[PDB]
Amino acid sequence: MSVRIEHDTFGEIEVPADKYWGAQTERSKRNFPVGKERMPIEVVYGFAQLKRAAAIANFDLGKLSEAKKDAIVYACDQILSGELDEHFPLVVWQTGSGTQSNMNVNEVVSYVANMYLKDHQSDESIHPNDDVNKSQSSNDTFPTAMHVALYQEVETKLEPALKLLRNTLKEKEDKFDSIIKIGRTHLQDATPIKLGQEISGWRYMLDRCETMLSESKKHILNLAIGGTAVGTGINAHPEFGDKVAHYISENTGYPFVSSENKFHALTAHDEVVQLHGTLKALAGDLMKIANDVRWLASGPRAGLAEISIPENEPGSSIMPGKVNPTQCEMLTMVAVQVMGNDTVVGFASSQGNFELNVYKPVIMHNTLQSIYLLADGMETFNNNCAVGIEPIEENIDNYLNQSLMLVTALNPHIGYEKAAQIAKKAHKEGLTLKESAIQTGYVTEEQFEAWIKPEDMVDPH
Amino acid sequence: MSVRIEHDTFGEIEVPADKYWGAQTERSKRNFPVGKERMPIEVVYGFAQLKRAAAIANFDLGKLSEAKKDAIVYACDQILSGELDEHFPLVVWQTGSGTQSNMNVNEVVSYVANMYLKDHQSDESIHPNDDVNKSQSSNDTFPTAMHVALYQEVETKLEPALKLLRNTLKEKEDKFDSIIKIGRTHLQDATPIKLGQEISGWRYMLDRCETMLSESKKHILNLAIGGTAVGTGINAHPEFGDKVAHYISENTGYPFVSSENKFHALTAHDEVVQLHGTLKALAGDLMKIANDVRWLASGPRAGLAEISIPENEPGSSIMPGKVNPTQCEMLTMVAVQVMGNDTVVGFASSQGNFELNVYKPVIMHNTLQSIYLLADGMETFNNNCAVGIEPIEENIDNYLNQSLMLVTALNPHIGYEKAAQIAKKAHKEGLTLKESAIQTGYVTEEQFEAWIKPEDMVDPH
Amino acid sequence: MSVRIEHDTFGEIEVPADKYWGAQTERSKRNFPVGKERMPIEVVYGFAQLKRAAAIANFDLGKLSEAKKDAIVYACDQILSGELDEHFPLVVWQTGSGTQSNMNVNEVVSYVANMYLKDHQSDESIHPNDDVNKSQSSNDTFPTAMHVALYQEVETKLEPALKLLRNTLKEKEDKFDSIIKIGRTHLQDATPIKLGQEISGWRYMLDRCETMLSESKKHILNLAIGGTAVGTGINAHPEFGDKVAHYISENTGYPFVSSENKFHALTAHDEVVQLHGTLKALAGDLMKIANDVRWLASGPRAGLAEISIPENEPGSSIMPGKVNPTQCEMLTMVAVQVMGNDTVVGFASSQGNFELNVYKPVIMHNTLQSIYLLADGMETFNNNCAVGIEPIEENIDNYLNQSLMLVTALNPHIGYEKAAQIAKKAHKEGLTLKESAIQTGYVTEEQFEAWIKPEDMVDPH
Amino acid sequence: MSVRIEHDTFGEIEVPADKYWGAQTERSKRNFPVGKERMPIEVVYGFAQLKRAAAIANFDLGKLSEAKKDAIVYACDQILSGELDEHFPLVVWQTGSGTQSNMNVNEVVSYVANMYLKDHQSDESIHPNDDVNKSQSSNDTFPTAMHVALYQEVETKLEPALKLLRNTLKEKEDKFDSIIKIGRTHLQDATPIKLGQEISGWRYMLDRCETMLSESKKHILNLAIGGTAVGTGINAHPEFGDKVAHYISENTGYPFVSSENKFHALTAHDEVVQLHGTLKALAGDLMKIANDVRWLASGPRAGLAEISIPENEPGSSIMPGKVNPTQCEMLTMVAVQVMGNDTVVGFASSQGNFELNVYKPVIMHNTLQSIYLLADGMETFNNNCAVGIEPIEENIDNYLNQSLMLVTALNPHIGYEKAAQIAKKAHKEGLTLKESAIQTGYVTEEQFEAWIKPEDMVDPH
Numbered sequence A, B, C, D: 001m002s003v004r005i006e007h008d009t010f011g012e013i014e015v016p017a018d019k020y021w022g023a024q025t026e027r028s029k030r031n032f033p034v035g036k037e038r039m040p041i042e043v044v045y046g047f048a049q050l051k052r053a054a055a056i057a058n059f060d061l062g063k064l065s066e067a068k069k070d071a072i073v074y075a076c077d078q079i080l081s082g083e084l085d086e087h088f089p090l091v092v093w094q095t096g097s098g099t100q101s102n103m104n105v106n107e108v109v110s111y112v113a114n115m116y117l118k119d120h121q122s123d124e125s126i127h128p129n130d131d132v133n134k135s136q137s138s139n140d141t142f143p144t145a146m147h148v149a150l151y152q153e154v155e156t157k158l159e160p161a162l163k164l165l166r167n168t169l170k171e172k173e174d175k176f177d178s179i180i181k182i183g184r185t186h187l188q189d190a191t192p193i194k195l196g197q198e199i200s201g202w203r204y205m206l207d208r209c210e211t212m213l214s215e216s217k218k219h220i221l222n223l224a225i226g227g228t229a230v231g232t233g234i235n236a237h238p239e240f241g242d243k244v245a246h247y248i249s250e251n252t253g254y255p256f257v258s259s260e261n262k263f264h265a266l267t268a269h270d271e272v273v274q275l276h277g278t279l280k281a282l283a284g285d286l287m288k289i290a291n292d293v294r295w296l297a298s299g300p301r302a303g304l305a306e307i308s309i310p311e312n313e314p315g316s317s318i319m320p321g322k323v324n325p326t327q328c329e330m331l332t333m334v335a336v337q338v339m340g341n342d343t344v345v346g347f348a349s350s351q352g353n354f355e356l357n358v359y360k361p362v363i364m365h366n367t368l369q370s371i372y373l374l375a376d377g378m379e380t381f382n383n384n385c386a387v388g389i390e391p392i393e394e395n396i397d398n399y400l401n402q403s404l405m406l407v408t409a410l411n412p413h414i415g416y417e418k419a420a421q422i423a424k425k426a427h428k429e430g431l432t433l434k435e436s437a438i439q440t441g442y443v444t445e446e447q448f449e450a451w452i453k454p455e456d457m458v459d460p461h
């Protein structure tokens, strides 16, 4: 229960003895006791990449000592290895520049760095602002950390999950290509379609979002670092920003660059708005896919029952055949969350004033959440549902054999009028087209098997 | 690191030894590893009120023994006293009916209740479904918990915070009523207005939201309990729902009732959409208020600087006068979050099918978050900013004395043309209206003091 | 091609000879050539009610002669009778205060009024600003016209349409109360439900929205008239605003009042945000209802086919049975429009500054459109679909007789385990519950038709 | 007042004698009397491009006579030359596939084409379905017309207007580069910034949206034509779709292609969702630009007054200096409209079922409107405001001279402590930091004029 006494302009303040933040973080924590949404640790890691790269760049410019640079890099690598997650207690609902989380990283980095210097018997000392935040400002760091973290989240979470689900749907598309079912438009019976063709629509949806995500994610590589307070770059070396972007690229493997216009970099979030547009496009596609799956799996006796899906929750021995599509429900709830998150991001990006947009935490919070919700949603839906999508061939065959929508294939052989009578007769008398077409005398058994081939009704000719 | 082995139809599964949930919660936890948003503990407490009331109602109907009832009630009160929050690990992104969190409560309640029975040397045993979920269904419990939790959140968090901020603005309105400033419309100079009158606009915004919140929160008192699986009430006593609503009311002090139409109660969330409409109304109002405050406090030399706000973060000795309106920024970020949350809720309420809307967790998540973000946001903005709003009379007086918009008060005395000359001359020559009116010879110095009384320009006459 | 030459302080400008607006409307029209959305004529009528009432009120205050008042009233009644719709050409995308449409009404009224005075051989002349806009401002008139027009739109369009559709669903609910179908939750087969009971959920949705609409529409009765430029009421008689509200009430039969806080009245649109919350709630309900109808009508052979709906478009004689639910598609398209309109309104209401919110035209445009889209949508969906909803009892009877979800009723008679065997057997062997129950020897043919009463399975007992 | 009697399956129906549509359009018009939003004529022109190309392609395949092809092509070019706009009376709120507008084009084209054949003494006759709609379906035509119309609207309206406003802002950026003002962050005074630098942020926002619009508009070039009813291409030649896209490209000059996946092409609108994501990004950017402009223009005496904007509406001679930023208000209202439109589009794209998304009209309506509102908004704001943005140098110079934020440039010379004393003294005693620096004895006036150079404070060094 012990504490450490820190100091600032307002006086003495207790910090928990086992926590590495300083007086700024503790007063900021107390001054914004709002909500339940901690500032995402992913942006903290983005700050650590930035502070790591800044230490090296400042060293290169002869502005930071070797020992200090080594100690800051070490402390930054402590954060990035996930050893210090509990030393970042600030909420999303802080100041709109994200300054307090910037100084939270400055203080923790400095605390761990000074421990390094002492263990190595150094006379030097790290200070949060003069050293860890050197050449930086409260205003160009959080947008840099945000873009670093958002791009990494796309690369490490969203891309592999999109590819996982897409490859499964592609495989189902190829395996079920020979299965002919009855299409539905307006929810009404339509002409035949291969089950694999229907699945191919879901699959190409994911290909389209992948193409579009590659376009929009590229603009997130543009970093604000180097604009300092108002975008002019005052109090920074003319090479500092490019150097930092270079070292973040080195450490992450992603081709970050310093923005061509730092005034845009502080005042705009149109690049994140565009990215979130891709996320909403994917969300809507995933909702449509998930709805098709659960409708196709509906039943067992009063629904469509064209496919089965895996049962992951225990059912009832007295209710055999009931499988709730619970993975579809998760994915569609994720989908509507992304759509609401899209509202926030689009609004917040419009609300900038002069030299800075101060809505950056809420933008980071919503965009990141949309990324990992789509990522985890697709991965889980893939593993726990999509890989287990199987046709129920008996029900699909019955739909094909019982359908009246095949009758148009009789038109080249007996004419529009004779086919119409057959379709009307089958409708009124509850017959199949085969039963009707033979009882009218217009088509024989051999002719009907020769003239009506559903495998010739799912392609242009 | 010890574990307890539980079992279901899928086999044996390890539960952490110090955790009170059963095989269903543990399998559900593993099957939905999605996102970072745990199902809100507030809705767990709503479930605890429900399970508590249902134990008493079932006891009244002769369906539950006294010992089982007392043990379930005790277990529910353990949950409601905050002793068991760690035993509810499931995320928002689960089944769309919230079944899994229902069974999480059934298991934890059953676990604690059986401990009670054994500590009292009872031969009876509690079972999660047969006892804790007796007369209930997977489908009518979560909407009941949701409405219980949302209404309580309005009563305990949103209402007191709204009244706190509103009372403060009312006090500033009365204190600054005698302070005459220059209105602005289109951001252009306009006729005088009392500073208290401008604040009265903010205050009445909060009064209006309170009136509208009293109307919309009343519909959240309608509970689904008693409709069971599809709304028909099968497998429940005809009095069960009404008895449960009665006991929840007894235990909470809020006048809950069983819904007049259980089919609506399972399939619709229009009552929550209306409530969230009020929350969005408040959010937009608070954003406007917060923008007025930070614009009035802008400066110290290149802004409007009509007011001072308290400084909570440490400033700079080399930058005196700079106070960032950081509480305004927090409150506007909360405001735009609520607007996005409103998008989710409105969408999700439209997506029901047949006998059940299965978007309930995400609706609960967003609406609850909107309630406590507005509550915490208003409370903190009140304490850390609003109570410290003070006028800067020198700056306000200069705006009034330098304004050309007072010239219209000369019209009844010297005429429109005579006043127009004075206003045009003052604009061209950089004079005050007083200086211009004397150098034209149209008004004396004594007449100008008698004819231009700003305190007569802020009321109808 | 004839023109009339008007003039202002910019010079001479041609007005079409057959058009009654003046130089300012002509200049405003040329300065905002934006989009395709004319400022809605309904808000012009709101202005006409306002100018009419203002003329009488000013006459009562001894500020306007009787002949001028009579001529202005006449001109306003010309507008309200729909004789002058072509004299209002300005778009929504004008100034944010609606000033240009205010002066459009001032000029047309003045033009028609001077024709009246000349036709009655009067020597006086009406002026748009000095007479038609007397005691008013650019800023308090448009919000007044907006609230007048929106409330009337609720009364004359939305309320009759909501009652028409609600009464139809109520009638279907009563007629189809004896029809027992199979419920669906998560799209999976569930226990029985009366068709009327399922419809009763749609019906009660509309009752709920009617209750909530009566609450939110009441706040639209609060008018801004009397606040003038900034809310202080300067240049208006202290009784003017209340008198105007009184006479608008007299002429419309709606109980309008002058707002308690004119500063709120100019700067806030939270009352309209709340109203739009009701509209979005109704829109989401209508989407759910419309989706239920088209899914229930899906088929003829590969869907659910529980109901028929009227066919309004000619189909093909070669495709008998295909009826596209085109009215459902119209209603859901209207529904999503209302949800996007809700976004605009909530955003725009947050964006006010100081003494005036200047987003009033776009708020009017979106809110009015939502009202008449829901009104026309409900009316047409009622007339062209809802009234023709009919059950297909053969398909409904088959669902009920083929369902395994009735097996629960066997439990009190033979036990859980025997009933489970019957349900398992019926599932494996493709049997009905009756066929399975008699082949196991557990239930008699007479016992089955005595123990399984679906009419006893749709109520609590 | 004369009528022509047409007929269909339901009987005889009157079409106005001067209108060229047939019985199906007249019946569809009566059956959807919903709203006030006519189906945009732009999508009618997209249909005309499609019917033109389809006539040629069908002729190339030997499915259509030369004379029929020439007559259909002629009728289509009559539509595209704007001669027939009044013959398309159907509203947006029709069926969700757009079938009725498809048939509206089929009937008008057929009517005009038969007039051509009879004028050329031809015995052949055009039929709306068998000829004008040959090889097409109700379902793949409207998405083709939508993409054709949307892409053209981007090319002909949005792109030229974006470039106009951007080129203007670039010109102001270059002219005002030598003007040094005071930056604002959080609305608080900050370090200096060139006026041109601040404008460069606006300009680069438009560059960014141009880059992102080039990426997203490309996906709108993928057309559904060839998928026919369900995407399988049945009842169409395997080359038909590609031929149509080729001839639309020939006639428009835009590189349209037939979609790689027709099933996606009918069921998805993620390509339009992404495009509308760009439009919302631009809208948000334009709102920020417009707000900076009206805040910078605020005044004349109680605002910021750093710039002047042109006055387009006549003002009052008794209120000189009053210029309402009315073009800024227009542009921000357009901006929030685009944001609400984005909600509709994102929702509607998620709501497809199986082989067809039937939300296509509402998607077309909102996306087109967003395009032309931004286009007309940018063009008009450019012509009527942006081109006339001029600095008010005396006010900008006074901000720079009066600012305390320049003091940091004294640190390299006198140190942090002595500079802090100067800034503190200047703040307390209402001095310029020049007056304070000389009164402390720390800096000579020759030193101050040499050490403090704002032109060196707006770049890295």
Ligand SMILES: O=C(O)/C=C\C(=O)O
Pocket: A097, A099, A138, A139, A229, B324, D185, D186, D188
């Ligand atoms: O962002 C901050 O808190 C520090 C300085 C400023 O940008 O005003």
Ligand SMILES: O=C(O)/C=C\C(=O)O
Pocket: A324, B097, B099, B138, B139, B229, C185, C186, C188, C190
């Ligand atoms: O959800 C459940 O666990 C059980 C039944 C149902 O709601 O279908």
Ligand SMILES: O=C(O)/C=C\C(=O)O
Pocket: B185, B186, B188, C097, C099, C138, C139, C229, D324
């Ligand atoms: O809007 C007007 O026409 C006049 C004054 C103002 O409201 O700024």
Ligand SMILES: O=C(O)/C=C\C(=O)O
Pocket: A185, A186, A190, C324, D097, D099, D137, D138, D139, D229
């Ligand atoms: O819209 C039609 O032409 C009818 C059916 C379909 O093609 O889906």
Ligand SMILES: [Cl-]
Pocket: B170
């Ligand atoms: Cl009071």
Ligand SMILES: [Cl-]
Pocket: B260, B261
């Ligand atoms: Cl009732």
Ligand SMILES: [Cl-]
Pocket: C260
């Ligand atoms: Cl009051």
Ligand SMILES: [Cl-]
Pocket: D170
């Ligand atoms: Cl250039």
